[PDB]
Amino acid sequence: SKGEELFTGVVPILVELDGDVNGHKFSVSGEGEGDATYGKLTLKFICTTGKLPVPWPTLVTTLVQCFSRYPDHMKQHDFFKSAMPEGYVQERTIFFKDDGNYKTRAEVKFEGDTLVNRIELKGIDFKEDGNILGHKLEYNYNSHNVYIMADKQKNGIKVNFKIRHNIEDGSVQLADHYQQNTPIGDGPVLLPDNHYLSTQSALSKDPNEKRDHMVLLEFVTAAGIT
Amino acid sequence: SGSDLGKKLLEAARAGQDDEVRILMANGADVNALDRFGLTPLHLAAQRGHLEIVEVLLKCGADVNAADLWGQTPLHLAATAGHLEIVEVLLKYGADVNALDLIGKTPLHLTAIDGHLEIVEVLLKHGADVNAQDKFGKTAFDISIDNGNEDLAEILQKLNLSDIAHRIVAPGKGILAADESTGSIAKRLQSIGTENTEENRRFYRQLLLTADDRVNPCIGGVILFHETLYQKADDGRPFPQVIKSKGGVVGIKVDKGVVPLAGTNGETTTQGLDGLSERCAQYKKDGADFAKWRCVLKIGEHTPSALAIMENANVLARYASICQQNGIVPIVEPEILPDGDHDLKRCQYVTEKVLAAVYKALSDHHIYLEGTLLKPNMVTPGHACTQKYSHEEIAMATVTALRRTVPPAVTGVTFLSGGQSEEEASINLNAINKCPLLKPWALTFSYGRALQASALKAWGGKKENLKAAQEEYVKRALANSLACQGKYTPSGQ
């Protein structure tokens, strides 16, 4: 593809998040770098508000997800690098068991040389003593599989994947995701088949910072056709 | 112009301005600049690929093991984009080879995921961790297979499977054979005065393992059973977690019974071919690095002929084609039962015919000879023979019969007891190492009866005789450890 040649080297990534749940206004502004040749993600999320009500491990698979390492025999089944540098509207609606639901809307596009993306996180109807809001989960994120399907109705890709989170009691929490990527431009857009990738994230802290943050280190590596 | 010396230094090291780094370092700028991310200029000088910039920062006082917020040392970025001349410079000033980031992956794993060829051989020369794990439990072998590498999925495994053999047949250690199944331990535990229960079979194996600490450098490998690995000790620690903690390798018996042939005269085979690909993926995670493939061979009027040799030539090669793709070291044991009556001129003739077809099929099924072990039987006459021989004539024909078929690529060659006496098996072993012949391989002991004969008669079947049964095992462990080196003098034994 013509858009895959623009991801050669180090490209700066700008994270611009602004959500509002239960009347609590919060904004997350982070920055870092990326690599699409070998699949390396290096970001540093900085909470500009302070005390974030929603947990951190539940907001990992949000932005980026475009610097993946695709094999030599899977270059024709790409969608994140096909709408470049036009961009695509990434809309998701994360569900849960018996709690609430999320509603994000990302616009992964370039403005010259730095990847700028804005997400308007919405969603109401939550609890005050469950996993969300109340600090009950731990600070760890294991590996998960992301299955990518296909769609030929509204010209897009319907990504469906189910992950899980940990706590401090012994239960198992299951979540549902319904990602719908819609391109912006009307140029050459490829149509991938069905394949799954990998996710090797890593969360830590930083003694040289007083405010809340999240040191994320994710390693994305593609596999094959399921 | 001269303000912010740390911000302007990272800009020249990122793009590759060689005419701007020397000017900043000649005035009075900090070589270890720490901005909002704590990224030292050494990372940008090795990630993009500029060897000239690295040679200047190292001659001033830059930290080679400077960890940032993600714990990524500059050694990781030096071997990421695909550069060889940069990694060879950082390894000369004393760098952290076992660097661990947030997950805990050594720089050796990054050379296999990307696609490095000559860079992998550089990290294995100074000394890197072979069995390096992390939070996910993946080493440098279960990752390169899913990627699709040819010079990394077959060459890197040749070093991991061969390094374990050096800690088994080492001059001083040995192999403890103890894989008595349910159809073999009941015979020895019948004429003594005991029975065959689950408690008797479990307590008997704990006496030879959990004992005195003077048997650690003398025992390198312990052969167990599939049921033994699923049992724990009385202290609270599993069996594999005790052998590897003192300096030993845990084994497991994988071969089953025997199957008689058709139209022969007592020729049998070894069962254990089906389901091999499903058992190697589980025994490796438990702590088993080898096994024990025992066969049944006898010498009669016409056995073996032109059928038992060809049949066993393919079974011994097919087993080594699956265990090497997981992490199990195959051990070929061409045991020949000295049945009937024969002299040294006849027993040696049969040995040269069976061993000639062993390594013949190994060169076809792609078998790494420098990472396998062989357990051949001694050249001893039959029990019905009337002509006696000394200890020097037996060891003379034993070494000669092995140098004709066994290639020098074998790490170590072991032996068996031959069903003889306990003391006789230790005297004939010392005469083999004292033979005036150049032996390229190593020799050690690997008995399966003489190493535990004294610990069975004096044990009885009670609980107060635990200190009396472990005392006889110390004398047998030190006697066999000296016969493999050439300094064994039989005093009062």
From Swiss-Prot, chain A:
Gene Ontology biological process terms from the UniProt entry: bioluminescence; generation of precursor metabolites and energy
Question: In UniProt terms, what is the effect of altering Y38N?
Answer: In EBFP1.2; shifts the excitation and emission spectra to shorter wavelengths and increases quantum yields compared to BFP
Consequence recorded when altering S29R: In mut1.28; shifts fluorescence lifetime from 3.03 to 2.76 ns. In mut2.2; shifts fluorescence lifetime from 3.03 to 1.94 ns. In mut3.3; shifts fluorescence lifetime from 3.03 to 1.88 ns
Protein's UniProt keywords contain Nucleotidyltransferase: no
Gene3D superfamilies, from UniProt? Green fluorescent protein
Q: What is known about its processing and modification? A: Contains a chromophore consisting of modified amino acid residues. Maturation of the chromophore requires nothing other than molecular oxygen.
Which tissues carry this protein?
Photocytes.
Q: Which domain of life is it from?
A: Eukaryota
Tell me the outcome of changing V146I.
In Azurite; shifts the excitation and emission spectra to shorter wavelengths and increases quantum yields compared to BFP
Altering S171G: what's the impact? In GFPA; leads to enhanced fluorescence at 37 degrees Celsius. In Venus; leads to yellow fluorescence, improved maturation and reduced environmental sensitivity
What family is this? Belongs to the GFP family.
Origin organism lineage: Eukaryota, Metazoa, Cnidaria, Hydrozoa, Hydroidolina
Summarizing the annotation, the consequence of altering F45L is: In mut3.3; shifts fluorescence lifetime from 3.03 to 1.88 ns. In R10-3; matures to the red-emitting state with excitation and emission maxima at 555 and 585 nm, respectively
Keyword Glycoprotein annotated: no
Q: What is the effect of changing Y141C?
A: In mut1.9; shifts fluorescence lifetime from 3.03 to 2.74 ns
Q: Protein name, please?
A: Green fluorescent protein
Substituting T199I results in: Suppresses the 475 nm excitation peak, leaving only the shorter wavelength peak at 399 nm. In H9; increases fluorescence at 395 nm excitation
* Reported impact of D151V: In EBFP2.0; shifts the excitation and emission spectra to shorter wavelengths and increases quantum yields compared to BFP
From Swiss-Prot, chain B:
| Localization in the cell | Cytoplasm, Myofibril, Sarcomere, I band; Cytoplasm, Myofibril, Sarcomere, M line
Q: Where is this site: Essential for substrate cleavage?
A: C218, K253
Q: Which reaction does it catalyse?
A: beta-D-fructose 1,6-bisphosphate = D-glyceraldehyde 3-phosphate + dihydroxyacetone phosphate
Sites where the protein binds beta-D-fructose 1,6-bisphosphate? R188, S417, G418, G419, S446, R449
Transmembrane feature ranges: none
Show the GO MF annotations.
fructose-bisphosphate aldolase activity
Q: What PROSITE patterns does its record include?
A: ALDOLASE_CLASS_I
N6-(2-hydroxyisobutyryl)lysine is found on K244, K292
- One short Pfam name that applies is Glycolytic
Biological process, per Gene Ontology: glycolytic process; negative regulation of Arp2/3 complex-mediated actin nucleation; positive regulation of cell migration; protein homotetramerization
The effect annotated for K375M is: Loss of activity
Which family does the UniProt entry place this protein in? Belongs to the class I fructose-bisphosphate aldolase family.
Subunit structure as annotated in this protein's UniProt entry: Homotetramer. Interacts with SNX9 and WAS. Interacts with FBP2; the interaction blocks FBP2 inhibition by physiological concentrations of AMP and reduces inhibition by Ca(2+).
UniProt-listed NCBIfam families: FrucBisAld_I (NF033379)
Q: What else is known?
A: In vertebrates, three forms of this ubiquitous glycolytic enzyme are found, aldolase A in muscle, aldolase B in liver and aldolase C in brain. Alkylation of Arg-188 inactivates the enzyme.
Q: What is this protein's name?
A: Fructose-bisphosphate aldolase A
Question: What species is given as this protein's source?
Answer: Oryctolagus cuniculus (Rabbit)
